[PDB]
């Protein structure tokens, strides 16, 4: 039966059935021999009860050998018959490690679909992505990075007991690199202020507004969490100062004053609709817009809508070059998002961001970020519904960030 699969004899397999798991000097069963491209023989052996997880003298299962030799259909049937997707050889390599070393992308994807552990470590602590990088397999490294980040997004939602929405977009091309719940609505919270600032900058570009125009306001305009505007009651503030305060300090009165200039939440929604975002909507003012009532469509976006709109503001033709640089510069100077993506951002990286927090466990962030001092991707993360504490929500968002940075 060992010779009947070399040199294959698929009709002999059924005839000889005999020890289905007969061994040779290297611990190969007939299944190990057939794994090198004899699909029909593999199937016969498995049907007849071959030990799908038999390990040879080096620790290789048939799935390991099929991963090395590159036979997609044999990988698939072994898994169908219960092959251990995460079996480790004597070096600690799983089949996913082997597929990553040898450059077999289609096999990487089947293994991931069948529950391969993207974070499995060999005897020297190395994951499949580490080995893909070492062997120059950049497309596999990218796939493995996204998969590890989705593991973390789903872990965050488990820990928080709440839905988590995520998208990572290429800043230059607009390509969606990875996403989760990206078409579901979430409360924007103060992340809407980036869209407000974009609308203000658009009006400046058109000659409908002036950065230096001074706005006076009174005690009655002050709402909670207005750290800059509360200090300028006597002298007022210019449009520039208000936009700075709204973006970088999340100043709520500043945002409300700027909303009035554009016709309120309805005016911001009209600006969004006119640039092609028919999903994002603002309906209420600060602070009521943070209520996060279940099933309430008011004051919501989706991860893909927000990321797409933010990309158009920062890199599109919607704003003049000077204005799109001003938006980025204000977001770069954000002062109140420390515990989120900034808390895990490595030395030399660039980030321009805006965070939000609301009722019912709502938390989120929008960001343009990248290594070497230049942004190259947009990340949007939202969650709502959790009973967890603020520190817990912050840590889960930070850990998603650490994963997408590690896998960059």
């Amino acid at each position: 039966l060992l010779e009947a699969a070399r040199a294959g004899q698929d009709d002999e397999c059924r005839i000889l059935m005999a020890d289905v798991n007969a061994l040779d000097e290297v611990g190969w069963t007939p299944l190990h021999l057939a794994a090198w491209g004899h699909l029909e023989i593999v199937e016969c052996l498995l049907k007849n009860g071959a030990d799908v997880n038999a390990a040879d003298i080096d620790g290789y299962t048939p799935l390991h050998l099929a991963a090395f030799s590159g036979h997609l259909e044999i990988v698939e049937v072994l898994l169908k018959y219960g092959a251990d997707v995460n079996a480790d050889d004597q070096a600690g390599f799983t089949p996913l490690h082997l597929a990553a070393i040898f450059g077999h992308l289609e096999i990487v994807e089947v293994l991931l679909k069948n529950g391969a552990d993207v974070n499995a470590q060999d005897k020297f602590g190395k994951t499949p992505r580490d080995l893909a990088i070492d062997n120059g397999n950049e497309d596999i490294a990218e796939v493995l990075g996204k998969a590890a980040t989705l593991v973390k997004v789903k872990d965050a939602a488990d820990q928080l007991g709440a839905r988590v929405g995520y998208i990572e977009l290429d800043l230059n091309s607009g390509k969606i690199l990875e996403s989760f719940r990206s078409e579901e609505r979430f409360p924007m919270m103060s992340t809407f202020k980036v869209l407000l600032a974009g609308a203000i900058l658009s009006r400046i570009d058109a000659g409908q507004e002036q950065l230096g125009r001074r706005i006076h306001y009174s005690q009655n305009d002050l709402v909670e969490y207005s750290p800059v505007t509360e200090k300028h009651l006597t002298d007022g503030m210019t449009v520039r100062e208000l936009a700075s305060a709204a973006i970088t300090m999340s100043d709520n009165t500043a945002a409300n004053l700027l909303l009035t200039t554009i016709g309120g939440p309805k005016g911001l929604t009209a600006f969004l609709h006119n640039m092609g975002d028919h999903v994002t909507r603002l309906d209420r003012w600060e602070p009521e817009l943070n209520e996060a009532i279940p099933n309430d469509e008011r004051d919501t976006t989706t991860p893909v809508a927000m990321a797409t709109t933010l990309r158009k503001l920062l890199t599109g033709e919607l704003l003049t070059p000077a204005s799109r640089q001003q938006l980025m510069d204000w977001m770069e100077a954000d002062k109140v998002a420390g515990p989120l993506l900034r808390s895990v951002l490595p030395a030399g990286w660039f980030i321009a961001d805006k965070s939000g927090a609301g009722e019912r466990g709502s938390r989120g962030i929008v960001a343009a970020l990248g290594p070497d001092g230049k942004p190259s991707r947009i990340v949007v993360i939202y969650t709502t519904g959790s009973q967890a504490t603020m520190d817990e929500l912050n840590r889960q968002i930070a850990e998603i960030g650490a994963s997408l940075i590690k896998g960059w």
């Binding site: 070399r6 294959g8 290297v26 090198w36 491209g37 003298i57 030799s69």
Partner: protein, 228 residues
């Protein structure tokens, strides 16, 4: 499938020359015999020309000509080793002995006239003075192994990986993890294979006429792992 393969249709004489230095113990070995790739068969005798070999003979088997492997007809297009002939190939290895030192080897395998010659330099470091190697605790025998071969397109060559298992006199096994690269010496085109394996077996013996320190080797190797 390659012009080089025509050089291996019959019995071919072989010469092996090795210069070694393990933990500062310098030694040399000369070998001679013949190979018959039609059967995947090598027959060789080695002599230590510097006295007693300071490491066990079995530890040098893999260092002492994979062009003599039998490639079945349907796999001839995957035989890198013969395709590089007669100009030959460089074969480089690191061999890590578990819980012990390592060998680093560089060899050239090529025809010199009608003879296939393997000329090797070997450096060994970090061996334990009473480990299995310098303490001569390995049995005089040899196991069967699987040798894994993959193309390295960027180097116009191959990468090879496998683990050798050396029986120890107390019933344990000394592992020797082999990392290998082969690159052609010549400029002509070579065959770069799909991933496959070789199956090996080796028998060690002694020449009853020989008083010098020596090893007689009979080895069979067949390639497999590619279908039609």
């Amino acid at each position: 499938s390659s012009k080089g393969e025509e050089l291996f249709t019959g019995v071919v004489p072989i010469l092996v020359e090795l210069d070694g230095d393990v933990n500062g113990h310098k030694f040399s070995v000369s070998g001679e015999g013949e190979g018959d790739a039609t059967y995947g068969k090598l027959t060789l005798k080695f002599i230590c020309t510097t006295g007693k070999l300071p490491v066990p003979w079995p530890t040098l088997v893999t260092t002492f000509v994979q062009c003599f492997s039998r490639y079945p007809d349907h796999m001839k297009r995957h035989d890198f080793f013969k395709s590089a002939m007669p100009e030959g190939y460089v074969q480089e290895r690191t061999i890590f002995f578990k819980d012990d030192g390592n060998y680093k080897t560089r060899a050239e395998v090529k025809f010199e006239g009608d003879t296939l010659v393997n000329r090797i330099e070997l450096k060994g470091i970090d061996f334990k003075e009473d480990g299995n190697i310098l303490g001569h605790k390995l049995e005089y025998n040899y196991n069967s192994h699987n040798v894994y071969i993959m193309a390295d397109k960027q180097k116009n060559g191959i990468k090879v990986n496998f683990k050798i298992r050396h029986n120890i006199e107390d019933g344990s096994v000394q592992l020797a993890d082999h990392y290998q690269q082969n690159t052609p010496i010549g400029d002509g085109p070579v065959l770069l294979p799909d991933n496959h394996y070789l199956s090996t077996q080796s028998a060690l013996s002694k020449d009853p006429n020989e008083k010098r320190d020596h090893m007689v080797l009979l080895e069979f190797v067949t390639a497999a792992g590619i279908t039609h």
